[PDB]
Enzyme design. Structure first.
Site, short mmCIF file in Angstrom:
data_model
loop_
_atom_site.label_atom_id
_atom_site.label_comp_id
_atom_site.label_asym_id
_atom_site.label_seq_id
_atom_site.Cartn_x
_atom_site.Cartn_y
_atom_site.Cartn_z
CD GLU A 1 -4.82 5.10 4.28
OE1 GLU A 1 -5.30 3.95 4.45
OE2 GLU A 1 -3.77 5.33 3.61
CD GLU B 1 -3.01 2.46 -3.56
OE1 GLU B 1 -3.41 1.54 -2.83
OE2 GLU B 1 -3.47 3.59 -3.50
CG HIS B 2 -0.29 6.21 -0.53
ND1 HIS B 2 -0.67 7.40 0.06
CD2 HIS B 2 -1.30 5.34 -0.32
CE1 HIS B 2 -1.86 7.24 0.61
NE2 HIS B 2 -2.26 6.01 0.40
CG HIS C 1 -1.59 1.21 1.51
ND1 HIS C 1 -1.11 2.08 2.47
CD2 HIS C 1 -2.68 1.81 0.98
CE1 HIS C 1 -1.88 3.14 2.53
NE2 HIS C 1 -2.86 2.99 1.65
#
Ligand code: NA
Ligand code: NA
Ligand code: NI
Ligand code: NI
Lengths: 423, 423
Positions: B136, B64-65, B61
């Site tokens: 987040e 991904e960012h 993840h």
């Protein structure tokens, strides 16, 4: 170039006044069909057959619930047993019945026409359904999103029926009588007040013949004449500011602007399209304003700007979750004050027009969009509607027109700022 | 009859190991494209180039960012300036990058390949992004839906990484180093570990040549060998019952069942398809069980039953809002106890198979579904995937097989019942 769709659009009007539009797309498995009436929650008062009527709120939606009743059918199973499923909704200015499926389209179209063109009300089942709707109304008054929205409308509108939620109130629903329901059904569910639109993988010659045969076998009255009766709503809000506390875990802000009046047909198409572009340029996910608000933690990705336009009213809404609702409200007003002084930025405007042209082009791939929009624009007065009409407004729209629309509508004196604050 | 799609499916493998599948559909305005890697949140440990690695949670993840970082591009604007938009997600077992658009498809495919095949990490921007992800993570721990879900997983799983949320924890994200990110990117983002799938209104010969030319101009290492390393997870839950209090306005119930192990390829396709039918028959919106629960006010229309199956784990989840969570849990267990004793009802099963066949047929109309599913089944081991494979399982599936699947999986000893209760 003028828009050329890859498929046929076949639009005609039956002997009984029903307009039909078929869009066969042979490469697709799904057929999506919608039968809708120009009657919704805001049609509280009207004149027909020489008499003025004022109804309790809730009737469009009550009829929606009761439309599925049939002594000779489980209507949902009739679609399901042959590879389709059916649903409905009521909105401000229309009620819609629709299915989607993959085969036996002749049967489904027949079932759709049949269950919408007869109603089966009894004193008993009118009583039963009042309790069911009252409960639904209570539940929806506890939903925070729906509550913030309804507070904005209640602040914005003095008298217009749009200020009452689609289902009505407990009190009004309780006063509804079988006689009233039957009057409204007879007045508004005549085929001359309706539209049938179908898109997807079906044979257009086959289905056109089924519709004609189904309608030819029924007997309809002379079309009712309807005079729509609506109040003289002031152009300014009843209350321009509101806050309240609610069991929500973060604050929510809604800012709205009230149109002085509604719009019709090609004027409505133009104004709605123009706002879609403008709101994207002002507030959209790719705007520097939105990115600055997000970077500062003043909004999240559920932030949105939407426009609603009908024959007798219209409004803009912007907002969402807001950890600092006061700050967000100030930033929105400052942003607009600068654009109001300086004019719309041309580059942001062209990016917006291109995003929305793309979004519309991609949406014309979808049976549901094609159908829903054909229905919606037709019933709102575009009696000869064509999607090329929308595309052409997107092509020809100008920066001057974007500035004029902004100056007309996104002002301070027609604005309502409202917040829901954590209890 | 075996499924015949109306369009071409062109599937081949490039010199560098990348599998490409193009599905041109000339009647459509939209092209939808997805470039995905067989790497997700659960790939915590692995062996490659002769060494065993155990990573902090969160890396799929994090990459991904950071994939969108480029010194020579605003990646989002590169798509947007030419009529497309791009997004990504990370899930348990893959990470996906995708766009949709209406023109200049050659450019967009080039941009998609380019931004996924280079990464631009610095000590600085690795530090910046850690703060953004920690935040987040905090926000998502306050979301009630996500919280109930994560409590179920945490109860169900002893050691399997699926018990940690996709973004990782604050602690693990904080321990991630640039070196680790680069190792995982070099290991998992090799073209031999990836798939490119495109459907919609594009020229297949044109785009196939653009992809070959783009890849031929780059230099790739020898494909990394990856040994996937996963723990011996017990077949029983760590805790079979859990409740907690949270600022929610109504209770929520989730009941889950733990698969003893994951599945691969054609076995996974069969088991996933079989559960879709079974869960609809047991719990679907047209089941008498669901209608009885709704009539009794024990659920609302957001009630749902879902199945998740991957190479190394799988589970069923059922539930939603529940005003009387204890009562609902009892009714679910009773329902299942009767089906367990008496066998699946054949008529409910055939209605379910027909609903799901229709749902799948209609879904094959959609570029996004075609692409997402081709990607997903391919990466989970169906190396020669074809949608006809899914249709054929839907046609040939039997009541005996539905009973065997039920008996294997929907049991009492692999079940977790969990609730979130209003504070
Ligand atoms: Na009816
Ligand atoms: Na990149
Ligand atoms: Ni309702
Ligand atoms: Ni993220």
């Amino acid at each position: 170039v003028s828009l050329e769709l890859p498929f046929e659009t076949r639009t005609w009007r039956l002997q009984n006044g029903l307009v039909v539009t078929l869009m066969p797309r042979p490469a697709l498995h799904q057929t999506y069909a919608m039968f809708a009436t120009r009657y919704g929650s805001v049609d509280r008062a009207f004149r027909t057959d020489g008499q003025v009527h004022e109804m309790p709120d809730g009737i469009a939606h009550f009829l929606e619930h009761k439309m599925f009743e049939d002594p000779e059918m489980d209507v949902f199973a009739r679609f399901a047993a042959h590879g389709a499923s059916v649903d409905a909704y009521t909105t401000f200015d229309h009620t819609a019945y629709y299915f989607s499926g993959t085969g036996e389209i002749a049967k489904h179209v027949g079932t759709l026409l049949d269950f919408v063109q007869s109603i089966h009300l009894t004193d008993e089942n009118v009583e039963k359904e009042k309790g069911i709707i009252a409960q639904e109304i209570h539940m929806v008054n506890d939903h925070p999103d729906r509550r913030a929205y309804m507070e904005l409308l209640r602040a914005m509108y003095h008298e217009h029926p749009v200020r009452i939620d689609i289902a009505g109130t407990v009190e009004s629903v309780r006063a509804i009588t079988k006689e009233q329901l039957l009057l409204c059904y007879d007045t508004f569910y005549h085929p001359s007040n309706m539209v049938l639109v179908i898109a997807g993988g079906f044979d257009a010659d086959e289905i056109a013949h089924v519709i004609e045969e189904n309608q030819a076998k029924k007997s309809f009255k002379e079309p009712p004449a309807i005079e729509r009766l609506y109040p003289e709503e002031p152009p300014t809000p009843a209350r321009s500011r509101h806050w309240m506390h609610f069991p929500v875990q973060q604050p929510r802000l809604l800012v709205g602007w009230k149109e002085a009046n509604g719009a019709f047909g090609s004027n409505l198409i133009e104004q709605d399209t123009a706002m879609t572009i403008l709101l994207d340029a002002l507030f959209g996910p790719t705007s520097a304003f939105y990115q600055s608000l997000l970077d500062e933690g003043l909004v999240d990705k559920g932030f949105s700007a939407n426009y609603q336009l009908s024959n007798t009213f219209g409004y803009t809404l912007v907002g969402g979750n807001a950890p600092h609702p006061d700050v967000l409200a100030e930033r929105i007003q400052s942003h607009l004050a600068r654009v109001r002084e300086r004019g719309i930025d041309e580059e942001a405007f062209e990016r917006a027009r291109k995003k929305i042209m793309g979004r519309v082009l991609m949406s014309l791939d979808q049976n549901a969009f094609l159908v829903r929009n054909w229905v919606t624009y037709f019933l709102r007065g575009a009696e000869a509607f064509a999607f090329a009409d929308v595309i052409a407004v997107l092509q020809t729209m100008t920066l001057e027109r974007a500035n004029a629309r902004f100056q007309e509508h996104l002002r301070e004196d027609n604005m309502v700022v409202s917040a829901v604050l954590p209890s």
